[PDB]
């Protein structure tokens, strides 16, 4: 009875979570490729900062979305409206993807003053539609991410704690499985079959999630708003210019580590976007066995390799590291693990810098033409298997740094402020993505300039991206050294 009922409820919640994670990892994977493939093809780092700002907007709206949810509006209704806007955006995107609807919705180049000879005119034309789609999708997924975890949490919590542990083990497993399946199938479809259907499958996915969450609401267990103590912390902060001491301790303990982690999430999302771009400009193998115009090995498949290594490591990582690191001459602490993760990501960024330098030195001699997607990409004879080292380093650093940061944040904060520190974590991750996009904008602009070439759409093979990678690596190393120095005086 109760078993079956709560099981159906949490299974519906799990299906919605899997489908939303699937749609997210699907759209975010090949966004850079399609942003330069479609006739509104942007200019390289332009699409890179577009994806960076998308991720930053998601992670910035997450805390504000949770506040708005636990605010006047109802949590379940909040998730409903979030999924509605998410479906709106994931339906708007295939309209951009389909030629007829592309021409229809965006607008002809003769009306929006797009008569300038060059591909930049179509970009000026179709920029607002894509940006609106991106902002809608970002707000939707932000609210969904902020809301879905506490939702199933209270859905299961009523009975017992072991039920919550089992349900959230299932939650982690479903999230990772959805990530893997989405990456694989959706990226393969997008890159090797059709961008149209490649985006349309996320659409029907979001539709299924929305309808199952709507029909679940009838048999769900709703929860009235509690008060969203973010308003309390905001009131305290603006008036300063028993919750007082807890608030001040929580903030003073949380803000420094997350400030140090801001450049880390910067370089993480930069990993994502610019390594997708670099693999597009690196050498891609051929699956042309039964295929004409060979199916390309996806950078999203490389990200799947990363994530499946995360999956294989994390439990084994615990099981082997903990008992041995207990009796070790290299004893680990939360801050020391964050420092180790920062050093690993610095090494990965250095490796990426050397890889880009070698790629430039090689393309300076000769050039090949591998048609990834629907547009050609000039590349050099250097397989992308050299990105696997830096991807592995970034993955192990992900594990170390993020898990240590969350452990320290939770162990150094009261119980009630757990949602507040989670919101602040996602907020600082969004801040990191925004800082990354800003740094890219700064290195790209002609004011001082390191890689402009007046053409960044497909001619990045002459641009100096390795200088920007080394600048990011140097910033990360400076933050790591500062964290080391603060670790001494504390």
């Amino acid at each position: 009875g109760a078993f079956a009922g709560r099981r159906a409820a949490c299974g519906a919640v799990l299906l919605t979570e899997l489908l939303e994670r699937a749609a997210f990892y699907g759209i975010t994977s090949n966004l850079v490729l399609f942003l330069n493939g479609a006739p509104f093809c942007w200019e390289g780092a332009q699409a890179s900062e577009a994806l960076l700002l998308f991720m930053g907007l998601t992670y910035l709206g997450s805390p504000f979305g949770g506040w708005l949810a636990d605010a006047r509006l109802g949590r379940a209704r909040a998730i409903l409206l979030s999924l509605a806007l998410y479906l709106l955006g994931m339906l708007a995107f295939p309209l951009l993807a389909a030629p007829a609807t592309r021409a229809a919705l965006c607008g002809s180049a003769r009306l929006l003053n797009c008569t300038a000879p060059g591909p930049d005119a179509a970009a000026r034309c179709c920029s607002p539609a894509t940006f609106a789609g991106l902002v809608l999708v970002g707000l939707g997924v932000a609210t969904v991410k902020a809301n879905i975890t506490p939702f199933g949490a209270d859905q299961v919590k009523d009975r017992g704690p072991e039920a919550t542990r089992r349900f959230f083990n299932w939650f982690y497993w479903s999230i990772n499985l959805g990530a893997i399946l989405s990456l694989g199938g959706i990226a393969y479809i997008q890159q090797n079959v059709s961008f149209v259907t490649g985006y349309a499958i996320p659409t029907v996915c979001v539709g299924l999630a929305f309808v199952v969450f709507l029909c679940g609401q009838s048999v769900f267990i709703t929860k009235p708003p509690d008060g969203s103590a973010f308003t309390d912390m905001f009131k305290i902060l603006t008036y300063s210019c028993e919750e007082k001491v807890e608030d001040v301790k929580a903030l003073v303990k949380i803000v420094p580590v997350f400030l140090a982690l801001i450049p880390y999430w910067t370089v993480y999302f930069q990993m994502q976007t610019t390594y997708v771009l670099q693999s597009l400009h690196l050498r891609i193998p051929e699956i042309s066995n039964i295929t004409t115009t060979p199916h390309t090995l996806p950078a999203a498949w490389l990200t799947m390799f990363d994530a499946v290594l995360i999956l294989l490591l994390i439990p084994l990582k615990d099981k082997l590291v903990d008992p041995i690191l207990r009796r070790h001459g290299l004893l680990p602490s939360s801050l020391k693990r964050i420092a180790v993760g920062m050093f690993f990501v610095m090494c990965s960024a250095f490796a990426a810098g050397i890889l880009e330098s070698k790629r430039l030195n090689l393309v300076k001699e000769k050039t090949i033409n591998q048609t990834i997607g629907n547009v050609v990409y000039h590349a050099a004879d250097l397989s992308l298997w050299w990105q696997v080292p830096q991807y592995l380093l970034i993955g192990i650093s992900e594990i170390f740094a993020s898990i240590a940061g969350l452990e320290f944040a939770y162990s150094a904060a009261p119980k009630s402020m757990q949602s507040a520190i989670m919101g602040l974590f996602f907020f600082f991750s969004g801040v990191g993505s925004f800082v990354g996009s800003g740094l890219l904008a700064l290195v790209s602009i002609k004011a001082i300039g390191w890689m402009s070439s007046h053409t960044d759409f497909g001619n990045i093979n002459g641009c100096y991206l390795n200088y920007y990678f080394f600048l990011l690596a140097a910033i990360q190393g400076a933050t790591l050294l500062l964290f080391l120095i603060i670790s001494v005086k504390y």
Partner: peptide
């Protein structure tokens, strides 16, 4: 990002 898993997790394992 990819570990939102173990992160909600810390939360409740807690």
């Amino acid at each position: 990002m990819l570990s939102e898993g173990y992160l909600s997790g810390l939360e409740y394992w807690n």
